[PDB]
Ligand binder design. Sequence first.
Ligand SMILES: Cc1cc2nc3c(=O)[nH]c(=O)nc-3n(C[C@H](O)[C@H](O)[C@H](O)COP(=O)(O)O)c2cc1C
Ligand code: SF4
Lengths: 215, 56
Amino acid sequence: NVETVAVSPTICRRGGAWFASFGRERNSGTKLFNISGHVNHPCTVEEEMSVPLKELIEKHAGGVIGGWDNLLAVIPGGSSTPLIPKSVCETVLMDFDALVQAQTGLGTAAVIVMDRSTDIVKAIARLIEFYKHESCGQCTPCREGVDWMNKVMARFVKGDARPAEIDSLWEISKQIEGHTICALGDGAAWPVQGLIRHFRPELEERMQQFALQHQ
Amino acid sequence: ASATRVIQLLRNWASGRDLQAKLQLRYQEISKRTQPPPKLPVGPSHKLSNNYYCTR
Ligand SMILES: Cc1cc2nc3c(=O)[nH]c(=O)nc-3n(C[C@H](O)[C@H](O)[C@H](O)COP(=O)(O)O)c2cc1C
Ligand code: SF4
């Protein structure tokens, strides 16, 4: 990485133990955090590793738009990582192990926050559409399954689908993840898994409203 | 059947049973030869999830 290479000479000049002092064990050092989305002050700042997510947003980002109660979801490690709800991001640290314990993973520490005044399903569908537009198409799982997921995901925003499909979409991700050449298949399957796992009732509600409106 | 009362009584006496109750020829009691469409339900394996063929 650019960050790793850039921080290596300072590690050499100041010592390895000084850099190892920061953070927890196996999570040492400082990190660049890009806080974006529904924040008052979207910004990139360097900070110690295992900062609580709420503390980091409250200090450096100026607070989530509409106050902390307006918070709905946060994607901590970029589009690849699964999203987490407000309940678990209240007291979650920012490193590899603790974020893995949140079923997400640290990734690139690129925080994207969404308040409750936005369509979360639309955002996840845009992420899946991006992944569809960015796959090289070399192997059949990533290529075909990511296109397939995108089509299913688009309907989900509309709610044109059924409750049975949500379970089916999950299995599709199980077929993408772990079977591709590179990790773009994993990075395209994980957002869907997180959205399903944490907002299945929202998908059910949208489907019910669509079924009512179209009779 | 278009059988007169006298012939019916004679045939029931000769046979020994009540014949008009159980007739050999099919009349309007049978079903129509033009029927509504069916729906024909699908089988147990028509699930969308938890349906891998290696388990069935
Ligand atoms: C689909 C995909 C896209 C990636 N894009 C980048 C990228 O744009 N920049 C980057 O530094 N790493 C990217 N990576 C991760 C690279 O593997 C990583 O740079 C490499 O493993 C070295 O990382 P390191 O310096 O942290 O050890 C990507 C990985 C995947 C699977
Ligand atoms: S998983 Fe990687 S190698 Fe396979 S099609 Fe997608 S981008 Fe290409």
